[PDB]
Design a protein around this ligand. Structure first.
Ligand SMILES: *[C@@H]1O[C@H](CO[C@@H]2O[C@@H](C)[C@@H](O)[C@@H](O)[C@@H]2O)[C@@H](O[C@@H]2O[C@H](CO)[C@@H](O[C@@H]3O[C@H](CO[C@H]4O[C@H](CO)[C@@H](O)[C@H](O)[C@@H]4O[C@@H]4O[C@H](CO)[C@@H](O)[C@H](O)[C@H]4NC(C)=O)[C@@H](O)[C@H](O[C@H]4O[C@H](CO)[C@@H](O)[C@H](O)[C@@H]4O[C@@H]4O[C@H](CO)[C@@H](O)[C@H](O)[C@H]4NC(C)=O)[C@@H]3O)[C@H](O)[C@H]2NC(C)=O)[C@H](O)[C@H]1NC(C)=O
Ligand SMILES: *[C@@H]1O[C@H](CO)[C@@H](O[C@@H]2O[C@H](CO)[C@@H](O[C@@H]3O[C@H](CO[C@H]4O[C@H](CO)[C@@H](O)[C@H](O)[C@@H]4O[C@@H]4O[C@H](CO)[C@@H](O)[C@H](O)[C@H]4NC(C)=O)[C@@H](O)[C@H](O[C@H]4O[C@H](CO)[C@@H](O)[C@H](O)[C@@H]4O[C@@H]4O[C@H](CO)[C@@H](O)[C@H](O)[C@H]4NC(C)=O)[C@@H]3O)[C@H](O)[C@H]2NC(C)=O)[C@H](O)[C@H]1NC(C)=O
Lengths: 207, 207
């Protein structure tokens, strides 16, 4: 059996109303030795506000035991390291993994909206684009709105490392050509730690 | 004991008759005690015998790495033939088999749209030209940029992203000096995919 450690979701660390969690996942737990132990440490000191989630049975007769430790938003953003220690009979030793936020000076996203190409104006649905570039580190959230309400027919590329060490991505919202032609306003909402209030939004409409 | 990794041709290799597409079978962690390794190759389950196997190469961790390379016919790959590499070791409990092929499904033609810079970005010294490529299947694809027939190499392309209709999309961002955009030099996005006629299309962008 092997251990895998996962950071919080980007949006979770950026809004106080959300609950960021580090999650320790362990797999290949044979039914013969299905009892697993966890121990969590934050910046070298042990912590006890963690929990454990109910297990499952994978298709290969191996259990998948998990444990989520709730973290302070500011703890994670300030760089603290999260060590998860895993002990079991079938493992010769206690496995450990330490994870933290990427190191370095945060850099603010620049957000640019791009209207659909005229060539796409022959289709019944058109593509609205939100370029987000120059940000560091790569944790970011992007979503779309119209008239203050969610526009969910969108997909966003992962962050891509640019030649200057910052990241970019593009979000693509697909809407009915009719909606774009009447002049409705669409908005691209970006959250990132380096933005004021962790949030910014840019609009896009037919001129 | 040993592990086997099986690698496909690069996207452009199967798309141009000048290039040579290859499937590469790599065996690592071969021991000194049992160093002998045998490859068997199969196409749609029929054994083939034209592969080129290199002699074992000792690595700095005192294991051997052994490589066998199978030339494939472009149209065999594009027609979905399955390529199986079988690796035999006297230490191995049974031979290790790996198979690779093109991703399954009906190919779908990429639509290619160029997008000019946002007016907001027009206040910077450098500027971003966008090549949207969407609706393609499968996700093996190549994108590059040129101006006046010469490579424009200062670009980055997102990985393909699975869209909600089952096809893929990606963006390629070419960054150029804003001056070049404003004298009106023409930039071109070139795309290769099995579902394009002649496996190639090109879209231009200019002020
Ligand atoms: C002893 O050393 C050797 C050699 O290492 C060399 O020497 C030592 C001393 C050091 O100096 C090294 O730095 C030095 O490189 C070690 O051999 C290595 O063994 C590891 C683990 O066994 C292999 O890892 C795999 O790597 C492949 C990808 O490998 C390509 O990219 C590497 C760069 O990222 C590159 O180094 C490789 O050479 C190879 O490069 C490609 O080569 C092809 C063919 O020539 C070429 O056409 C390409 O252009 C070229 N590409 C590039 C970018 O250069 C990786 O894909 C593997 O991941 C799969 O397997 C993992 C399980 O091991 C799993 O976690 C992954 O998720 C993934 O799993 C696969 O997932 C897919 C779908 O996602 C699924 O379909 C598959 O079935 C599944 N496979 C599974 C589960 O097995 C993997 O990470 C190294 O390639 C190999 N190095 C070399 C040079 O061969 C050896 O480990 C050392 N031994 C000890 C005991 O220490
Ligand atoms: C039985 O069947 C089981 C179920 O199919 C199977 O379990 C699987 O086990 C494999 C390993 O054997 C494990 O694979 C790892 O996956 C890591 C990422 O997992 C993500 O994403 C995958 C899908 O992409 C999901 O399946 C996972 O559940 C997990 O999802 C995340 O879950 C958390 C939980 O809260 C969420 O918060 C996340 O949002 C969510 N994300 C996503 C996208 O879903 C992957 O990182 C691992 O790769 C690394 O380790 C490998 C060693 O095995 C290396 O080969 C590889 O190169 C990676 O190395 C790391 O690379 C880093 C970046 O470059 C470096 O910085 C590190 O240094 C380096 N570390 C190491 C140690 O190498 C790995 O592939 C699956 O996740 C797991 N599935 C599940 C559901 O748990 C069993 O294996 C099966 N057993 C048998 C015997 O058949």
């Amino acid at each position: 059996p092997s251990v895998f450690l996962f950071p919080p979701k980007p949006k979770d660390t950026l809004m106080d109303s959300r609950t960021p969690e580090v999650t320790c996942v362990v797999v290949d737990v044979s039914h013969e030795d299905p009892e697993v132990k966890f121990n969590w440490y934050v910046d070298g000191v042990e912590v006890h506000n963690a929990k454990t989630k109910p297990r499952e049975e994978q298709y290969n007769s191996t259990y998948r035991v998990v444990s989520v430790l709730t973290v302070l938003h500011q703890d994670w953003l300030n760089g603290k390291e999260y060590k998860c220690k895993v002990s079991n009979k079938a493992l010769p030793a206690p496995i450990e993994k330490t994870i933290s936020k990427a190191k370095g000076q945060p850099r603010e996203p620049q957000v640019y909206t791009l209207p659909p190409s005229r060539e796409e104006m022959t289709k019944n649905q058109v593509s609205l684009s939100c370029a987000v570039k120059g940000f560091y580190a790569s944790d970011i959230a992007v979503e779309w709105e119209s008239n203050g309400q969610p526009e969910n027919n969108y997909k966003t590329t992962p962050p891509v490392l640019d030649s200057d060490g910052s990241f970019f991505l593009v979000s693509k919202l697909t809407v009915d050509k009719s909606r774009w032609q009447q002049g409705n306003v669409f908005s691209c909402s970006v959250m990132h730690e380096a933005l004021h209030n962790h949030y910014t939004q840019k609009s896009l409409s037919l001129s």
